[PDB]
């Protein structure tokens, strides 16, 4: 709800820096990506809707435990709200926070030979909005620029000319570039008047407007809440 | 239909509507899938935590 | 002694009767005692849909509780009844309620 | 032969009749006080015999 | 050494009223022609006037 609710591009940094791994990541084991299931919407049909589930549904699925599953991870916790199951990270990874796992070379992670292409399949970057391909795109490109692979990034994107239109206009290194950029990565948020109380025929349409819906109750009522639990304890 | 309104809306967290079938919501919604969900681990799990 | 939520739970000797009809009757007014933010949502599902509620004090959003009865009622019983005779009676105060030219 | 003019312009603010609707309202208050009353005497009485 | 910058007037964005308002319209750069928020007396408790 937090990184979904952030809409520039300091905000996403800045939350990306204070949130650990274990947020990103989940504990419940979900079931296998890709597959052509039936679900049902009785809102609008008496038979069974089909649909297929992916990586950025926002349900936890199962993930290996290589490099890009702890990468697909973090990005489809930005995209969706929610994370994979990788089994058994460590106390070491779980500590440190997003940003770093993405733009630090001490998290003891080889984040290099990362295919750009296979990743962007995996998450099926061609069902992601404008917004979700943005936050993508923020990710690899603090990869790249970490690892030296600037130019791998720009092959990318040559050969994604629909991504290259809406490609962020930032620099890693750079601090004026984060400053002055206009761009809007805000997923959900308080709407004028309100939304519906219905459901949605996708997966991913009903699960994000699921996160919508229940924003506004989560804004009032979670300052409270958070306190009690972190009153009294060290952060990880 | 005040006994039923009041139910309803504490239900489905929206007033019955005309012109519109009630079926319940995204309460149904979400246990129509968990149902489905008990009954075998081939059946996907789609109903987010929140 | 405090308890878990952070009330206090007092101890004492007291009577079976006295202890049963006190308690029963402290369960059925705090079924009826909400906090604010439960209440806000209450009234926004009645209002309509771009009306809203106007902010309380941030104390009384954090720490804020109010009774509330959420019985409608009905006025079928004073309608269910044969109205010929005091209809002549109240269709004469509906014609006073309107100021008269 | 002799039919008066009602104005009535100064009732409406815009479309709205305060008076009105303000009539109308109190009326729910009636309705709670019905139904509050009707099952107290039932409660405190129970059933008559006469 | 002589002065060139010390300060000055600084403009504040933004002026938060600390106290309850009641409902208004536009007012100052727009206009709003519309008719004020009717104030209903609505939600009795006591029944008065009926």
Known sequence: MDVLSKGSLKELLAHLEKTPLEEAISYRIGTVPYQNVLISRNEY???????????????????????????????????????????????????????????KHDTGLVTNNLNYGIIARNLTVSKMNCEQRKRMLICFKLLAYKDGNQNDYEIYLNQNIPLKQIAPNFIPGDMRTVIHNQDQLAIVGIPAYRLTQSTELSIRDDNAKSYKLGYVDWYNSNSFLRER???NLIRL | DVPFVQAYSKFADDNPRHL???????????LTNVIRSYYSINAPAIVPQV | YPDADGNDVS??????????????????????????????????????????????????????????????????????????????????????????? | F?????????????????????????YATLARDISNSLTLVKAAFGPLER | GEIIYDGGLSSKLAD???????????????????????????????????
């Open chain 3, 11 to 101: 101890i004492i000797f007291s009577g079976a009767m006295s202890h049963a009809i006190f308690t029963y009757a402290q369960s059925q007014w705090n079924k009826n005692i909400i906090k604010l933010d439960d209440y806000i949502r209450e009234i926004t599902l009645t209002v309509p849909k771009q009306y809203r509620p106007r902010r309380f004090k941030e104390i009384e959003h954090t720490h804020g509780y109010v009774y509330r009865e959420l019985n409608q009622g009905s006025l079928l019983p004073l309608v269910d009844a044969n109205l010929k005779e005091s209809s002549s009676y109240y269709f004469k105060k509906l014609m006073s309620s309107i100021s008269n030219v």
């Open chain 4, 2 to 26: 002799a039919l008066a003019q009602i104005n009535a312009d100064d009732e409406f603010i815009g479309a709205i009749d305060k008076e009105s609707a303000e009539y109308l309202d109190e």
């Open chain 2, 20 to 30: 519109r079938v009630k079926t319940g919501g995204k309460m149904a919604n979400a």
């Open chain 1, 229 to 231: 639990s972190e009153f």
């Open chain 5, 16 to 50: 938060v009223v600390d106290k309850t308002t009641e409902p208004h319209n536009a007012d100052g750069a727009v206009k709003d022609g519309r008719i004020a928020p009717v104030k209903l007396d609505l939600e009795k408790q006591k029944l008065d006037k009926l």
């Open chain 1, 45 to 103: 049909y008496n038979q069974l809707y089909p649909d297929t589930t992916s990586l950025i549904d926002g349900v936890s699925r199962e993930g290996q435990r290589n490099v890009n599953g702890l990468i697909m991870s973090i990005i489809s916790y930005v995209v969706s709200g929610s994370g994979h199951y990788i089994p058994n990270i460590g106390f070491m990874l779980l500590r440190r926070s997003i940003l770093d796992i993405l733009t």
